């Protein structure tokens, strides 16, 4: 049903006409809001509760009410707070409900709120107009400063301070490169900026970093320079070769392979539901959590209630302060908020289905981010399977793997994150994520090689880790799942038919995990080889109907626990976790963990807490990531190759046999058949389409802000 | 003067093979026999294939235009007609018109080759199958009429063989499963419960014995003693079906073709070329072969002119089994001693490679006296991957898109051994990276289901234990990173707890990078499930444009199982299993990890890869990395009929680490870019806007045409 569908523009609009009329005037378009104002920061779908939904999907029951969730910024008042407000019911809403206290247990400190655009906007005037011209001396000799500075530019960092309550953000300055990436031109200057106040006027600059040293203020600095105790070096504002560009010099060649659907496309997309002769599901994007799918049904049978992105994380080293503070909790800005338009042919097959996404964020109207998702089938040029017999009997049987794919890409500053869920006709599911886009760069002063690699002119490639977190609500043959751990061992035995001789007996080992903690594995420890969620049920051969989680992760090694900050993303700590699903444990991180991870608005280690995971509705949680030491070949961009991570969800005695066997595209023939004949196999039936083939739609592109 | 053009890594042609055969026939002093009919007592040309050039000479030719080296071939010859019958390895050249033949056996090995090390001939298997079906199985006719539909001769029944044949060096006794022959699908599942330990050391098959029998869960001392028991009542007997329907039985999908899978086509020109053993793209050039036993290999790999790696080449495949029954419980298959090339098979167009791949034949003289030809053995194609190599969308300050969809160059062969269908891959990325892949599909070696099961796998069909096994494969990677002389580096990370420099009250966990130089062979020998440097890479003395050594990172992609424990005498035969990764001084006497002759005497192996790792520097030398890659397999229902690929994609990457000064892809023709201020719908701004207006037009397809079956 149109049940897990993100909110229509119409829906978004009408929640707003409510919120506005029913929060009094004195409410502001968050576009232009100052901290001490009341504004609505986000209106997005409030996902239904699970029980109420299944009821409606499986057993007639009418459908749970369709409800928004507005995050409201309550600045204008003596005790300013943030408030999560459920609104509804949709399409024509009548009620509203502060749920804040329910969830966290008290109000939301106002300093956990995400920085607004207008806030950045103000912060830049405080620098571009009031702090930088103090050093218009130095900046002219270092970096082409002209009065009053539209050649330079800023980039936020990580958490914003050192202990809770702080709202002080280190910014770098970079040249405002035209039509290409600025992230590689760290002008050498970093600035701590305390913007904790509700009055921007009282914002200060607690610190300043230049070519290796720290000065309490900007005058403090420009002075120390003008005294000739500081060696300026002129940084070139211009260049050639990828450092400075993306447009390739080399001109177009013969076009690259195109895939097309000879007989027309073999899947559909209505609303946000996807349907192919193997899979149905519903897809979507959470403004902050990012992309998610639900009600994944493989040939009518539900495999998972939910797979979704929880969080994404990035944790730096560095020369500089702004780098060596920096840990972004990117959901803190928002994977959905920052899903960019997909470029037809580049991001996705020219012939994918490209779907729009709507949102109301920091505004009062909804806007659309066109071509936000793509769905497509993709021949892999690979057997799903195959056998060829020359022994005893002559036959061949195999099948080319085509795969179904849904994808969106989130561009958050330097990074373009690639989010893939892919659907194998073996009944398997792959989640992949890819880090591409630009890197974050420092400016380079000598004391370096512990903090990364010179990738350029003046440019340090600043070491970091990536990590990402997924919710996997497997309902293996319905809710009650257990969790098993199969692996392996050798055992010195006698050889039965020569007990004088020894053999090394290979054995499987199985073990049921009964307790939330026995199924929480840290990065650094050993996962077992075979690990799955079972049902009480068995398949025909008497084997716990099961789905296996096989992880593709290169231990993006974790910020140690001893840090004050770590509870902001305690999931980085874990390779894998399973818990009892619970409406009150609905997410792994939250938009609010960004600006105060010392007071986690949600701390994941909580979820794990001496409970049974024996015949309960379980949910597994997977972390995926790698170490990234940037190197020259990351210029201009980091590439996808090798940097795919995630996991496989694989059938494991779930079925009675490989369901591909019932496949429509299986190919089979014997030594004694005419393999060249169209009704021995259909490959030998070239005709297929009429005219000159793949009919192609005229190119367009989403656009920008 | 001369870059040197010769293709000296191309495997032998038919002519060439014939030539060598002719040469040998004559110089062997009759008594010589065709392999496909040889008795143990005979003399026999087992293999003849390419001999690879020594490396000095090759590069001399290829780099400094020197004259190329003698093209030679290796002959394996079983001398069974004598008092100390030996196997011998013979070099024969120089092709095309040979005129010399030298015995290299003793030089390579330190003495002659114990005769029993030799693989088992198609004859030997035939002779065995007679001893079985014609002098033994009748002694139990009764049983088999009852359980197993038997008559004169058995004919509905079929054998299959296990790995190490015996329990010491010197043993040649194989445990032989027996199974229902099946029309047009896998006999492997339909194991009847009988298993025979044939002793076939003797060169006189008359003297061959059966030393033990196993029916359905008990050991009898001989098929005669089993009739004794059978008819005297004392043997409870399980009746296992001849026939059936579905997965355990068929392979034919019972379903009509749907509409059509998606089809990949190069909408103008292809974009690479194959010319003999040599492939060439805009970015990449390399030669590709097939060892008979070692299997697929490529050589002389060149990214934009520059050679990255001299050789990459599967060295060996393993399969270690657990079980209830004597077959499965001691089966440690060492698949090269059958041969990954030998058992290569034809790629079925439209399935095993895209339809419009370029396919290619593969000639061989094996257990024969005239060369023969696997048709379509290799395929080469440009797979678009559906997925950017890189992109960046900019909404912030500056409005631009720049990106490029990864398209990729693949080279595939599949060895089919018994049940196994190994897909071998080598994949070339526009980034300048090289991905090795490996799959296992096909059917699964199974046992008759009986008793302790769960300790040895899952039941997977009626009477059918999908037994537990591990996989391993070994690879040779002779990088030669901008030069022969390389070192190996090991970078990783660490967190240092420090006080925040600008607020000394507080701490931070300070992220740092750790570069450590690996200087001795043993410091770069990493064992299974272990300490493994996140960034491990081989590099040059020479540095890039920003001062960092020029390097290639080896990124492993394995899930390996517990190796065979080292306390087994048999362990030595695949010592490479116990390593994820090694790096050694590359040598002419260290050419292969394994040996076709290891398989039948791992107790005294022909090669023991652990020998390559001796107190030796790897500080600036010719360096060859050795990646072991694989995993554990507990079969299950969805392995029926075939184990599927999805998720068993094992192997590794070769990834460029400060080898360049920028990403090569910056220069790709297929790159795309536009500014906000432009129309991206206009053909001159965007190559892709021009695809509808023009390119479209799919080609007419070649008529399908499979390359059929052997004998
Ligand atoms: C976080 O911050 C938010 C916003 O500041 C809080 O939201 C309000 O909190 C206060 C209590 O702390 C409550 O405000 C109530 O406002 C209502 C205003 O009237 C409504 O609109 C119309 C009339 O214009 C009516 O038709 C509706 O029935 C509404 O009532 C009002 O109902 C209520 O009552 C009265 O109480 C006092 C004392 O007598 C008077 O000041 C007032 O004039 C009136 O007589 C409150 O004033 C309510 O909880 C929230 N209001 C809204 C709109 O959300 C959160 O409570 C804060 N969170 C935390 C944890 O503190
Ligand atoms: C393995 O087997 C081969 C063949 O059985 C052995 O090689 C053979 O060695 C004999 C002598 O050892 C050679 O014959 C002799 O030639 C000389 C002069 O030409 C002559 O004086 C002798 O009377 C006899 O004719 C024979 O040619 C040679 N054959 C081949 C094909 O090389 C070999 O020695 C065995 N290997 C080992 C390690 O023992
Ligand atoms: C940063 O530089 C960019 C260009 O590199 C500026 O963007 C353009 O500037 C022109 C100036 O007339 C204006 O029309 C727009 O501002 C931009 N044009 C387009 C087509 O995008 C930008 O103003 C600079 N600085 C900041 C802080 O945004
Ligand atoms: C096992 O069964 C297969 C049936 O596929 C037999 O193969 C056929 O045998 C006949 C008689 O020899 C041949 O003429 C056909 O050409 C064969 N057909 C195929 C498809 O191979 C096989 O001979 C039987 N028995 C054994 C021991 O292999
Ligand atoms: O989306 C923005 C927008 C920023 N500034 C512009 C300023 C002008 C109007 C649009 C908002 C800015 C910005 N402006 N100065 C520093 N940063 N940052 N980010 C951002 C987004 C995700 C993650 C990090 C930053
Ligand atoms: O290629 C064969 C061929 C076998 N038998 C042949 C079939 C063809 C005619 C002569 C006898 C046999 C065979 N015949 N009886 C038992 N085995 N085996 N294998 C084989 C190949 C690779 C790995 C393992 C076995
Ligand atoms: C002094 C000189 O050669 N300057 C050139 C300039 O003309 C060109 O525009 C620039 C890219 O913007 O590259 C450089
Ligand atoms: C499997 O067992 C649980 C025991 O708690 C039971 O409640 C459940 O209903 C069983 N499954 C079915 C289909 O009855
Ligand atoms: C966990 O809960 C059980 C009650 O079901 C209790 O017996 C056990 O002692 C508890 N463990 C801890 C560490 O609190
Ligand atoms: C964290 O690390 C070790 C653990 O004993 C210790 O040196 C240090 O005191 C710990 N931090 C504390 C107690 O705040
Ligand atoms: C590196 O190799 C050796 C050191 O053992 C030396 O002779 C050679 O000159 C060196 N080359 C460079 C570029 O450092
Ligand atoms: C390696 O040999 C031994 C240890 O195996 C040691 O004494 C020696 O110093 C090493 N030799 C050289 C030449 O590097
Ligand atoms: Ca819990
Ligand atoms: Ca569940
Ligand atoms: Ca060595
Ligand atoms: Ca080397
Ligand atoms: Cu990165
Ligand atoms: Cu397997």
Short mmCIF file of N, CA and C in Angstrom, two decimals, chain A residues 594-664:
data_model
loop_
_atom_site.label_atom_id
_atom_site.label_comp_id
_atom_site.label_asym_id
_atom_site.label_seq_id
_atom_site.Cartn_x
_atom_site.Cartn_y
_atom_site.Cartn_z
N UNK A 594 24.64 15.10 16.24
CA UNK A 594 25.70 15.88 15.56
C UNK A 594 26.33 16.90 16.49
N UNK A 595 25.50 17.80 17.02
CA UNK A 595 25.96 18.96 17.76
C UNK A 595 26.15 18.80 19.28
N UNK A 596 25.68 17.66 19.78
CA UNK A 596 26.01 17.23 21.13
C UNK A 596 26.04 15.70 21.20
N UNK A 597 27.17 15.10 20.82
CA UNK A 597 27.44 13.69 21.01
C UNK A 597 28.02 13.38 22.37
N UNK A 598 28.04 14.36 23.24
CA UNK A 598 28.52 14.14 24.59
C UNK A 598 27.27 13.82 25.43
N UNK A 599 26.14 14.37 24.97
CA UNK A 599 24.80 14.05 25.43
C UNK A 599 24.02 13.44 24.26
N UNK A 600 24.33 12.18 23.95
CA UNK A 600 23.69 11.51 22.86
C UNK A 600 22.21 11.66 22.96
N UNK A 601 21.57 12.13 21.92
CA UNK A 601 20.13 12.05 21.87
C UNK A 601 19.66 10.62 21.68
N UNK A 602 20.52 9.78 21.10
CA UNK A 602 20.30 8.34 21.02
C UNK A 602 21.63 7.68 21.11
N UNK A 603 21.79 6.73 22.00
CA UNK A 603 23.07 6.07 22.10
C UNK A 603 22.81 4.60 21.92
N UNK A 604 23.46 4.04 20.91
CA UNK A 604 23.15 2.72 20.45
C UNK A 604 23.51 1.64 21.50
N UNK A 605 24.61 1.75 22.25
CA UNK A 605 24.95 0.62 23.18
C UNK A 605 23.81 0.29 24.16
N UNK A 606 22.95 1.29 24.36
CA UNK A 606 21.71 1.13 25.10
C UNK A 606 20.88 -0.03 24.55
N UNK A 607 20.70 -0.06 23.24
CA UNK A 607 19.83 -1.08 22.60
C UNK A 607 20.21 -2.47 23.05
N UNK A 608 21.49 -2.70 23.29
CA UNK A 608 22.01 -3.99 23.71
C UNK A 608 21.99 -4.13 25.23
N UNK A 609 21.12 -4.98 25.78
CA UNK A 609 20.88 -4.89 27.22
C UNK A 609 20.24 -6.08 27.87
N UNK A 610 21.02 -7.14 28.02
CA UNK A 610 20.57 -8.39 28.64
C UNK A 610 19.12 -8.74 28.34
N UNK A 611 18.79 -8.92 27.06
CA UNK A 611 17.47 -9.42 26.67
C UNK A 611 17.64 -10.70 25.91
N UNK A 612 16.55 -11.45 25.79
CA UNK A 612 16.56 -12.68 25.03
C UNK A 612 16.31 -12.28 23.56
N UNK A 613 16.96 -13.02 22.67
CA UNK A 613 16.77 -12.92 21.23
C UNK A 613 16.52 -14.35 20.73
N UNK A 614 15.73 -15.07 21.55
CA UNK A 614 15.28 -16.42 21.28
C UNK A 614 13.78 -16.35 21.02
N UNK A 615 13.41 -16.46 19.76
CA UNK A 615 12.02 -16.41 19.37
C UNK A 615 11.42 -15.07 19.69
N UNK A 616 12.05 -14.00 19.22
CA UNK A 616 11.48 -12.67 19.35
C UNK A 616 11.46 -12.06 17.98
N UNK A 617 10.77 -10.93 17.83
CA UNK A 617 10.86 -10.16 16.59
C UNK A 617 12.21 -9.52 16.65
N UNK A 618 13.16 -10.00 15.86
CA UNK A 618 14.52 -9.46 15.95
C UNK A 618 14.82 -8.40 14.90
N UNK A 619 15.86 -7.61 15.16
CA UNK A 619 16.36 -6.64 14.18
C UNK A 619 17.86 -6.68 14.29
N UNK A 620 18.54 -6.83 13.16
CA UNK A 620 19.99 -6.84 13.15
C UNK A 620 20.50 -5.51 12.62
N UNK A 621 21.72 -5.16 13.06
CA UNK A 621 22.31 -3.87 12.80
C UNK A 621 23.71 -4.06 12.33
N UNK A 622 23.95 -3.59 11.12
CA UNK A 622 25.24 -3.78 10.48
C UNK A 622 25.95 -2.48 10.17
N UNK A 623 27.23 -2.50 10.58
CA UNK A 623 28.21 -1.45 10.40
C UNK A 623 29.17 -1.85 9.28
N UNK A 624 29.52 -0.88 8.45
CA UNK A 624 30.33 -1.15 7.27
C UNK A 624 31.17 0.06 7.01
N UNK A 625 32.46 -0.17 6.78
CA UNK A 625 33.36 0.93 6.56
C UNK A 625 34.80 0.51 6.38
N UNK A 626 35.63 1.50 6.11
CA UNK A 626 37.04 1.27 5.81
C UNK A 626 37.90 2.43 6.31
N UNK A 627 39.22 2.16 6.37
CA UNK A 627 40.23 3.20 6.53
C UNK A 627 40.55 3.91 5.21
N UNK A 628 40.65 5.22 5.22
CA UNK A 628 40.97 5.92 3.98
C UNK A 628 42.13 6.89 4.15
N UNK A 629 43.29 6.52 3.60
CA UNK A 629 44.51 7.33 3.65
C UNK A 629 44.68 8.01 2.30
N UNK A 630 44.20 9.24 2.13
CA UNK A 630 44.15 9.61 0.70
C UNK A 630 45.49 9.61 -0.02
N UNK A 631 45.43 9.36 -1.32
CA UNK A 631 46.60 9.17 -2.17
C UNK A 631 46.33 9.88 -3.47
N UNK A 632 47.37 10.00 -4.27
CA UNK A 632 47.31 10.89 -5.42
C UNK A 632 46.07 10.62 -6.32
N UNK A 633 45.80 9.34 -6.55
CA UNK A 633 44.74 8.91 -7.45
C UNK A 633 43.37 9.26 -6.94
N UNK A 634 43.28 9.97 -5.82
CA UNK A 634 42.00 10.46 -5.31
C UNK A 634 41.71 11.85 -5.87
N UNK A 635 42.61 12.34 -6.72
CA UNK A 635 42.49 13.64 -7.32
C UNK A 635 42.08 13.45 -8.74
N UNK A 636 41.01 14.10 -9.16
CA UNK A 636 40.13 14.98 -8.42
C UNK A 636 39.23 14.25 -7.43
N UNK A 637 38.96 12.97 -7.71
CA UNK A 637 37.96 12.21 -6.95
C UNK A 637 38.45 10.87 -6.45
N UNK A 638 37.84 10.43 -5.35
CA UNK A 638 37.97 9.07 -4.95
C UNK A 638 37.04 8.25 -5.87
N UNK A 639 37.50 7.07 -6.23
CA UNK A 639 36.79 6.22 -7.17
C UNK A 639 36.09 5.13 -6.38
N UNK A 640 35.14 4.48 -7.04
CA UNK A 640 34.34 3.44 -6.40
C UNK A 640 35.08 2.12 -6.21
N UNK A 641 35.90 1.76 -7.17
CA UNK A 641 36.61 0.50 -7.14
C UNK A 641 37.12 0.13 -5.76
N UNK A 642 36.75 -1.04 -5.24
CA UNK A 642 37.32 -1.59 -3.99
C UNK A 642 36.69 -1.04 -2.72
N UNK A 643 36.09 0.15 -2.83
CA UNK A 643 35.50 0.91 -1.73
C UNK A 643 33.99 0.65 -1.58
N UNK A 644 33.55 -0.52 -2.03
CA UNK A 644 32.17 -0.95 -1.81
C UNK A 644 32.15 -1.64 -0.47
N UNK A 645 31.14 -1.34 0.33
CA UNK A 645 30.96 -2.06 1.57
C UNK A 645 29.50 -2.28 1.90
N UNK A 646 29.30 -3.28 2.74
CA UNK A 646 27.99 -3.62 3.23
C UNK A 646 27.83 -5.09 3.57
N UNK A 647 26.79 -5.68 3.03
CA UNK A 647 26.50 -7.02 3.43
C UNK A 647 25.53 -7.66 2.47
N UNK A 648 25.55 -8.98 2.63
CA UNK A 648 24.68 -9.86 1.94
C UNK A 648 23.72 -10.45 2.93
N UNK A 649 22.46 -10.48 2.50
CA UNK A 649 21.40 -11.20 3.15
C UNK A 649 21.12 -12.36 2.25
N UNK A 650 21.46 -13.56 2.71
CA UNK A 650 21.38 -14.76 1.88
C UNK A 650 20.50 -15.89 2.45
N UNK A 651 19.63 -16.50 1.62
CA UNK A 651 18.83 -17.64 2.04
C UNK A 651 19.69 -18.75 2.58
N UNK A 652 19.23 -19.39 3.65
CA UNK A 652 19.97 -20.50 4.22
C UNK A 652 19.08 -21.62 4.81
N UNK A 653 18.74 -22.55 3.92
CA UNK A 653 17.66 -23.48 4.11
C UNK A 653 16.39 -22.72 4.34
N UNK A 654 16.29 -21.52 3.80
CA UNK A 654 15.04 -20.85 3.87
C UNK A 654 14.12 -21.51 2.89
N UNK A 655 14.56 -21.66 1.65
CA UNK A 655 13.77 -22.41 0.65
C UNK A 655 14.05 -23.91 0.73
N UNK A 656 13.30 -24.67 -0.07
CA UNK A 656 13.50 -26.13 -0.19
C UNK A 656 14.51 -26.45 -1.30
N UNK A 657 14.70 -25.46 -2.19
CA UNK A 657 15.69 -25.50 -3.27
C UNK A 657 15.86 -24.10 -3.93
N UNK A 658 17.02 -23.87 -4.56
CA UNK A 658 17.26 -22.62 -5.27
C UNK A 658 16.07 -22.17 -6.17
N UNK A 659 15.38 -21.10 -5.80
CA UNK A 659 14.19 -20.72 -6.59
C UNK A 659 14.45 -20.24 -7.99
N UNK A 660 15.72 -19.98 -8.32
CA UNK A 660 16.13 -19.68 -9.72
C UNK A 660 15.82 -20.88 -10.63
N UNK A 661 15.88 -22.08 -10.05
CA UNK A 661 15.56 -23.29 -10.77
C UNK A 661 14.23 -23.17 -11.49
N UNK A 662 13.28 -22.46 -10.89
CA UNK A 662 11.99 -22.19 -11.55
C UNK A 662 12.08 -20.98 -12.44
N UNK A 663 13.29 -20.66 -12.90
CA UNK A 663 13.52 -19.37 -13.56
C UNK A 663 13.02 -19.39 -15.00
N UNK A 664 12.46 -18.26 -15.42
CA UNK A 664 12.04 -18.05 -16.79
C UNK A 664 13.23 -17.89 -17.78
#
